[PDB]
């Protein structure tokens with residue numbers, strides 16, 4: 001576990017970042033795959049939260065990988081890493097032409113076939129309804145195609161890097177997916193499956209009839225993006241471009257800038273209702289134009305087609321979470337010459353989008369200052385009428401916990417830092433005035449909740465509890481006196497601490513550039529967080545920083561039942577039997593050979609939470625980048641033991 005950093009007082013944040021960078025990139029540490037250089041979720045394999053295995057990769061991890069190299073370039077002058085990062089990304093996690101066969105057959109007038117979402121995984125599979133549901137049109141596909149070709153240039157969210165699930169050939173990296181079955185399907189209640197479905201495993205129809213009930217079943221591929229990964233990546237490329245041109249080295253990143261621009265154009269797919277229904281309809285009214293556009297970054301876009309015969313479909317998402325917005329990236333593609341969309345309409349849509357997102361944050365801001373969850377255009381996932389007294393935002397209903405309820409998707413304080421960091425960069429770069437009150441109220445709140453201790457430790461909010469509703473959006477912030485957030489627990493999360501330090505340093509930099517004076521308190525708090533995360537969680541084996549966490553939730557390894565429909569039967573690539581009655585561990589039987597299996601299992605027997613040490617990729621990067629931000633805007637600042 002953790003031991004104190006030996007670091008000398010007066011070490012520059014530049015030098016600290018260079019130390020952490022070195023450790024993240026050292027092949028002996030094992031942050032990246034040995035064969036292809038893909039960044040794993042974490043060094044440890046036994047870990048369950050969003051991904052359910054440590055040696056998956058996620059598009060998230062890649063976005064952080066790009067961010068890290070951007071900062072490296074800034075501090076160092078060597079830009080090759082940014083190119084390498086983006087190469088690995090397109091070689092592996094972006095589906096190429098050969099992996100989206102006959103996407104060319106996609107029809108904008110009939111994007112997809114409607115299906116309900118339900119409040120429990122037991123209700124699934126969900127029935128596809130070519131019957132009685134007319135679906136809206138896709139107003140974006142044509143001008144995307146016209147600029148780019150038939151294919152989708154987005155990152156699929158999840159990939160099994162060393163094929164630990166077995167769905168793939170030999171040891172190759174394989175697209176996989178998990179979440180399918182509505183709001184009550186946590187990480188613990190899923191059935192992992194390949195994205196390219198060849199019936200090679202599972203039941204007779206592979207895994208399909210587990211999730212979506214069709215009249216007939218055929219071999220198909222499907223993908224899902226998590227747009228916050230794309231936002232982060234393009235955001236990183238903006239900085240890579242800016243910093244590189246300052247050095248007279250813009251040519252080293254021009255191709256990546258171009259790819260990032262394209263990527264940004266495609267994120268437009270994330271702006272529409274799941275089935276292109278009218279925003280605010282409270283009904284399954286198909287939409288014709290941009291009437292289906294909420295103009296926010298929804299939870300996903302997903303698309304697929306047949307492997308055999310050629311056909312295709314695409315969905316947006318009706319659900320929107322504040323934690324997924326990126327008004328900064330929005331603003332980059334809307335206004336910045338080098339990131340101008342090739343499409344004829346992208347610049348205009350993005351211009352609408354970023355402003356629209358900036359209003360979202362404002363609408364969601366509780367009376368205390370933290371940002372509430374979000375909003376939906378399809379109540380209970382089936383476009384029902386909104387309950388009486390439901391406050392709205394351009395027609396969408398307020399939801400405290402968009403998409404997931406176990407745990408509620410806005411319980412995690414991490415989103416506050418992640419999401420408002422972007423708003424800070426936006427204020428840094430525009431001096432936009434309309435956003436000043438949002439930012440200050442949020443900073444005030446966060447400053448009131450950070451705990452510093454005289455022994456040099458720290459604590460930050462971990463879990464949030466929400467009550468009430470925002471007032472209905474009128475174009476203007478009311479103060480939401482009846483929307484409340486309460487911090488219910490605190491911890492020592494290293495990525496979240498890095499992320500929040502970034503936000504405070506960036507904000508501080510922004511007050512210097514645009515306001516009467518530098519916000520000295522925000523700047524100093526950024527430095528405290530970084531000092532304390534590094535001093536207190538240093539890894540003496542040289543792997544960077546390292547967490548120590550009681551994972552009570554790990555009892556679900558052995559206690560959680562995974563719904564399988566009665567009568568359904570099938571097998572994982574290693575024989576593990578998929579049938580009604582199974583627990584998490586039953587379909588992930590290889591876990592028993594994990595170095596940390598004994599430890600978590602013995603803690604199960606004795607009825608106690610096991611204690612884990614984790615080096616997550618993104619924890620290390622969020623901390624490193626925070627250091628790099630201090631190095632960039634406050635180059636005289638200098639580490640000291642806290």
Ligand SMILES: OC[C@H]1O[C@@H](O[C@H]2[C@H](O)[C@@H](O)[C@H](O[C@H]3[C@H](O)[C@@H](O)[C@H](O[C@H]4[C@H](O)[C@@H](O)[C@H](O[C@H]5[C@H](O)[C@@H](O)[C@H](O[C@H]6[C@H](O)[C@@H](O)[C@H](O)O[C@@H]6CO)O[C@@H]5CO)O[C@@H]4CO)O[C@@H]3CO)O[C@@H]2CO)[C@H](O)[C@@H](O)[C@@H]1O
Nearest residue numbers: 112113114115157179212214222224225226300302311313
């Ligand atoms: O016409 C010719 C042939 O057509 C066939 O019929 C087609 C039909 O035309 C077409 O409409 C249909 O497409 C549907 C698919 O069947 C179905 O798979 C798809 O389901 C979606 C589902 O609606 C959606 O909610 C779900 O989203 C998941 C997502 O996959 C998952 O990745 C995501 O996880 C996120 C985590 O929550 C988050 O924490 C993490 O950070 O990021 C992740 C997001 O990146 O969670 C979401 C939900 O929360 O995805 C699935 C797809 O994966 O819906 C389509 C339309 O309804 O396909 C049919 C074929 O199957 C006929 O079969 C044939 O006869 C004809 O010849």
